[model samples]
Target: SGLVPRSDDEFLRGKRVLVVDDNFISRKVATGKLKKMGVSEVEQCDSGKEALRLVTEGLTQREEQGSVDKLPFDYIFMACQMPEMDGYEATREIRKVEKSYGVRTPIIAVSGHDPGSEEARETIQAGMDAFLDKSLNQLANVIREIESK
Candidate 1:
């Protein structure tokens, strides 16, 4: 359960996942593991505020700023616990603005907490499309859920 990847195509490929966590170590580990899982497009944000900004306005500005490039994100993997703004609260804010862009981008909560833990349910209720345990290195289930929904 620590780092067993079911397969290369389990929940990654061209899949773009946003890793939002205040902890630098968590973000680094998450990004490294996600890439190992074959997720080519992984982006990391230091805080919920930054994640929300990217989801709405920062993306465009970043693209145009001296780069003149265009790239779109497909999924958002958020960590619910943070110092300033938690993923739940920030995700709710993102949802409000995402509606204007006809964006159906799914937000999945990433946590080290167990699914049986109360935090999981609270996070889901907070607005996450799904919850993935940090120990769940295998994203076979994540991909299935995404497809099913």
Candidate 2:
């Protein structure tokens, strides 16, 4: 058997990524890292409400185009704790809309809480596909993991 050559950064170059976090510095760091990873179509939202709005609008246009997989955002790095609408609530709402079309966008909960913590568990229970530490060190791996599924 022979292995095929793959461009190190090709996979994520075309992906549309959304980073939702209230912490400005955290958002910047993650956003910067994502850009470095070859993801140019990145958007940042400081609040869950704003994230929800952006996704909703994007999904709407795609829905009109008619395809379950035709999502505007390829990956969402959602912060677990926000002031008004937390990541859990935001993801819950997004799932509600997705349910109507039998469509799902991968949402990775980015939180300061540990993987097994109560907060992290709640995030998954709400609707996120996975959880990542707020540090986002494993962000690239997580993206690859999700895309491989």
Candidate 3:
């Protein structure tokens, strides 16, 4: 079926996603691509700290509202590097919410981390569910892979 998501769309359609990157250009590119792939609801933050705040605060409000599936994000896509707080730290903070009401949000690392390098290992070990290099040519395929998974 055509509705069968081919890539990140597999995981993203009608899903709440948070994109954190300090670079406006990257954010714009990623957001555009994500929207094209069927992420109807996507939020963006210029920094990892900002992204963490949105996830934590938004989830809290949803809990207080006693609503279902109201959490701001179902998945978080973070870049490896940032000016103030890196993606790894931001993800850890989001994951620190109470176990009873854990974020449970999948964290994916979309970065320019060199291919076939140890830096990639660090991103994975730091708690990212997926890691890949960033490039316009590779974006769709990578996203599709994540979506397909």
Per lDDT, the best of the predicted structures is 2
Query: Residue 96 error for model 3, in Å?
Result: 1.0
TM-score of candidate 3 relative to the true fold? 0.76
Higher-lDDT candidate among 1 and 2? Answer: 2
Write candidate 3's Cα lDDT for 1-149 as tens digits. 01111145554467767888898998888777778768778889899778877887888888999888866776677887887788777776776763448546667776664534564555555556665445434544554565566
Candidate that would win on TM-score = 2
TM-score of decoy 2: 0.86
| lDDT of each residue in 5-106, candidate 2, tens digit only | 114455478788999999999999888878877885999989988988898888888889876667878888888888989888999998887777667888
The residue ranges of model 3 lying beyond 4 angstroms of the native Cα positions read 1-11, 98-100, 115-118, 136-149
How does each model score on lDDT? 0.69, 0.79, 0.67
> What's each prediction's TM-score?
0.76, 0.86, 0.76
Residues 31-90, candidate 1: write the lDDT tens digits.
887887788788899998898878777455544573333335666777878877888788
lDDT agreement of model 1 with the native: 0.69
| Inter-residue clash pairs, candidate 1 | none
Clashes of each: 0, 0, 5
Candidate 2: deviation at residue 87, Å? Answer: 0.7
